[PDB]
């Protein structure tokens, strides 16, 4: 299963921490605040996204992750409620949980989940809820594995990341926010993978709802 914690930093508007197997990410959110003159948008909210790796300095490998995170997060936020304001989102990877020289999908899923939790904790207006899982297809057996380990990634044939959008009590799928597939596959494998991923994402979003309700309710009267 997964472990998530809410509200752990003192000088930001919202924060969270997501753990899945051996992957660990901490995220923070500050906004809405005043932006720089070159970041300003006349009618909607602007975003500034930073991702930092576990070892070394940031390179072009983190730029792709920032691009995908920005693609996922833009339709989730009700951006027109905060004209010409800024929201800062920073993710720090503490433990990759995989071999960074070859794979980066577990980090992407963990960052997506942590950023959503921090956005909920901060108080930003959101259109709906989200959940993200990694998937792999293993050689020889040709079996589809949800949440693969680091050992199963080393003998895989294709790796996938799926992020979905849920409404109406976490029971209706509204859109596919991101699907990222790399490897070698045919159509039947793809349409089996989507069907399995939908159920796994539904279970994950139910669990996330329970965690959020447990954490937030004591703060209110």
């Amino acid at each position: 299963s997964v472990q998530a914690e809410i509200g752990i930093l003192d000088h930001v508007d919202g924060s969270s921490e997501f753990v899945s197997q051996d992957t660990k990410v901490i995220c923070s959110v500050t906004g809405p605040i005043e932006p720089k003159a070159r970041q300003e948008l006349p009618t909607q909210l602007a975003l500034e996204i930073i991702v930092r790796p576990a070892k070394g300095v940031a390179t072009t490998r983190e730029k792709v992750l920032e691009d995908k995170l920005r693609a996922v997060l833009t339709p989730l936020i009700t951006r027109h409620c905060y004209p010409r304001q800024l929201c800062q989102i920073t993710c720090q990877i503490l433990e990759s949980g995989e071999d960074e020289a070859e794979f980066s999908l577990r980090e992407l899923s963990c960052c997506i989940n942590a950023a959503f939790l921090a956005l909920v904790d901060a108080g930003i207006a959101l259109n709906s809820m989200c959940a993200s899982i990694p998937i792999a297809i293993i050689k020889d057996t040709s079996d589809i594995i949800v949440d693969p380990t680091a050992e199963q990634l080393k003998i895989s044939l294709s790796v996938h990341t799926l992020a979905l959008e849920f409404v109406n009590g976490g029971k209706v799928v509204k859109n596919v926010l991101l699907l990222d597939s790399n490897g070698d596959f045919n159509e039947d494998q793809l349409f089996s993978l989507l069907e399995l991923g939908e159920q796994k994402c539904q279970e994950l979003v139910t669990n996330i709802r329970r965690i959020i309700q447990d954490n937030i309710s004591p703060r209110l009267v």
């Binding site: 009700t78 108080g123 959101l126 709906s128 809820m129 209110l220 009267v221």
Partner: protein
């Protein structure tokens, strides 16, 4: 009454007209009512709103706030309500019995108690140092000396609007003090001796760190015993 999430079904009859409060959005394209915040939905000519946790203040008309003077212009002051936020403006004619000969004498770095009067979406918010709706002047103006405490918004609302919140009563049982409460997340206190003000500051910080209102008295007693 119930816990709600963004994207959930709104449990209100579409026929009955209901005025919308914070946390509820009307779609400009589909004309649909949906919630956008997480928390508890309260339904009271009836009004519905969602109570959610927050720390970043957004100006709203008829709110009591505490600000800092950060710049003086030809006709108004430049005022900050929170670090890293856009500033607001306070006009030289927004004081009681003000005229072009009776100018105000505030400096950069002063604390002020004011009310939000204009919060247009396309403009910069404005504040005034007197209640223009009623003509009353109840505590608005400069705050001399004292100390400032940062809290979250729900705590400040509980202090200002709930008379069954027991913090002020337990504080009054130890010392005499002055207080001003701002809905932007600021509390100002002052006592005759510095040790009493320090004890009040420590008590308020510790009480805000907690969520149980039944432990306030023990915290206050321990803190006021600490200063000897």
């Amino acid at each position: 009454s119930t816990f709600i999430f963004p994207g959930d079904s709104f449990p209100v009859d579409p026929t009955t007209p209901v005025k919308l409060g914070p946390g509820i959005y009307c779609d400009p394209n589909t004309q649909e009512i949906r919630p956008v915040n997480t928390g508890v939905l309260h339904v009271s000519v009836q009004t519905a709103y969602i109570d959610y946790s927050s720390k970043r203040y957004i100006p709203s008309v008829n709110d009591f706030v505490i600000g800092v003077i950060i710049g003086t212009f030809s006709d108004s002051y430049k005022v900050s309500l929170q670090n890293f936020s856009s500033s607001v403006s306070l006009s030289y004619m927004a004081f009681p019995n003000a005229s072009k000969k009776n100018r105000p004498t505030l400096q950069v770095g002063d604390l002020v108690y004011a009310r939000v009067c204009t919060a247009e979406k396309e403009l910069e918010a404005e504040i005034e140092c007197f209640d223009s709706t009623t003509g009353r002047d109840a505590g608005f103006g400069i705050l001399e000396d004292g100390m400032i405490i940062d809290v979250n918004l729900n705590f400040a609302r509980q202090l200002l609007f709930n008379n069954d919140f027991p913090l002020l009563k337990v504080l009054a049982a130890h010392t005499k003090f002055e207080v001003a409460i701002g809905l932007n997340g600021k509390i100002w206190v002052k006592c005759e001796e510095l040790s009493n003000t320090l004890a009040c500051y420590r008590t308020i910080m510790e009480c805000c760190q907690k969520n149980d209102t039944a432990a306030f008295k023990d915290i206050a007693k321990r803190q006021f015993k600490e200063i000897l």
